[PDB]
């Protein structure tokens, strides 16, 4: 009987008007005072959440009026009338009607731009790192948009799972794109049992998968 | 006029105990509940403490190792975690209910010792190059290129915590293929916690 909140979308791309929603699994309306126990917060990386709107529709003092919460019962929305660069952030809803308190999954506000395919590079382990008994292979996906992307590692055409880690940058200050690295880590001993190393990229800006490879 | 000041960053080892404080001002402390929230990548509500009776209330996943306490005369609330685990690694917030969140206290729990990174080259129309900054602890590492002179098309990735318990990251940059013979590319890596600095010239 934990209250569930489903927040959508998980991301949207803007100086236009944007809308995010929060659907509660149980009414958050207090019959007694007629308030809805739902708040909206903004939060930027490294920072703490900042209250925008409480009791569903009341703006907190000093919060710019481009921010507008509305809704009742189980249906709630946050609207930003006109997105500014300072508003690029994560936003989430919180229900404080019952314990345990529960949160929406969040909505990230990014900048919209045109679709851009990623440029793809694969990097073999340096000879110096091999000296030390481990091999790191790097696949870069450079300056793409939107953020969604799929990378697959193939060693001797075998599909690799569980042995890579990905990392991604925040939206580029200049061109609003994203970059992504994927790093395949294995023992020099396993490395040296195989010959062909490839990473397969899937992206909207690509009419079909791009593969980059090398062999020892 | 409400402020919640929290204690500073913590670096602990598994099994130890940490005590985080939240100092409140601008209101009647003993009238309003203090809540605690854990943020790793979403937010997890840990429970609340009654600032009037002292009685703590714990969410299901936070029962055995977590203690909420107060020093009411000092307008301060405490979160104590015992038998620390790796996955206790997170930012912890106290909050005055839904109204106002503390600044947060980052906790990192690890058995790893301080260690400088090894720095490897990512060789070599457009060419990509970079530096792999491997096996360091703790965060953070910072990277520039040619002492700050080259920032266009530079992407320095957020670090990942590896299987080994050590961090790793990469910094990359795209240049014309034509300049590879003539331009010098050096990544400057700084890991202050170990006083490690490395300049790694990157060559085709």
């Amino acid at each position: 009987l934990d209250i569930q909140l489903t927040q959508s979308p998980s991301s949207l791309a803007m100086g236009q008007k944007v809308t995010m929603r929060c659907k509660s699994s149980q009414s958050l309306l207090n019959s007694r005072n007629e308030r809805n126990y739902l708040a909206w917060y903004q939060q930027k990386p490294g920072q703490s959440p900042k209250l925008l709107v409480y009791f569903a529709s009341i703006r907190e003092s000093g919060v710019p009026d481009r921010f507008i919460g509305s809704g009742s019962g189980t249906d709630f929305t946050l609207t930003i009338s006109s997105v500014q660069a300072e508003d690029l952030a994560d936003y989430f809803c919180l229900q404080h009607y019952n314990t345990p308190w529960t949160f929406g999954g969040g909505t990230k506000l990014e900048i919209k731009r045109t679709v851009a395919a990623p440029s793809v590079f694969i990097f073999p382990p340096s000879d110096e790192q091999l000296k030390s008994g481990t091999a790191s292979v790097v696949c870069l996906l450079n300056n793409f948009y939107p953020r969604e992307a799929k990378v697959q590692w193939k060693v001797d055409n075998a599909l690799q799972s569980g042995n890579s880690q990905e990392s991604v940058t925040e939206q580029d200050s200049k061109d609003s794109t994203y970059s992504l690295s994927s790093t395949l880590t294995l023992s020099k001993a396993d490395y040296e049992k195989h010959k062909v190393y490839a990473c397969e990229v899937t992206h909207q800006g690509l009419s079909s998968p791009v593969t980059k490879s090398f062999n020892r | 006029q409400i402020q919640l000041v929290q204690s500073g960053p913590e670096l602990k080892k598994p099994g130890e105990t940490v005590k985080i404080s939240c100092k409140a001002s601008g209101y009647t402390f003993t009238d309003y509940s203090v809540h605690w929230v854990k943020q790793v990548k979403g937010l997890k509500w840990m429970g609340w403490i009654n600032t009037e009776t002292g009685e703590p209330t714990y969410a299901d996943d936070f029962k055995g190792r977590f203690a909420f306490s107060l020093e009411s005369s000092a307008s301060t609330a405490y979160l104590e975690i015992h038998n620390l685990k790796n996955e206790d690694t997170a930012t912890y917030f106290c909050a005055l209910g839904w109204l106002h969140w503390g600044l947060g206290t980052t906790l990192t729990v690890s058995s790893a010792s301080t260690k400088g990174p090894s720095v490897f080259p990512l060789a070599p129309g457009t060419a990509a190059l970079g530096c792999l900054v491997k096996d360091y602890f703790p965060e953070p590492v910072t990277v520039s290129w040619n002492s700050g002179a080259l920032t266009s098309g530079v992407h320095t990735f957020p670090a990942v915590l590896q299987s080994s318990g050590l961090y790793s990251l990469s910094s990359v940059v795209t240049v014309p293929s034509s300049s590879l013979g003539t331009q010098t590319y050096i990544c400057n890596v700084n890991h202050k916690p170990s006083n490690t600095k490395v300049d790694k010239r990157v060559e085709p």
Partner: peptide, 19 residues
Amino acid sequence: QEKNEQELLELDKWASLWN
């Protein structure tokens, strides 16, 4: 009047925060 309503809103706000 609208002042009552604003005062009310603050009282509801803080009531919701009470132990």
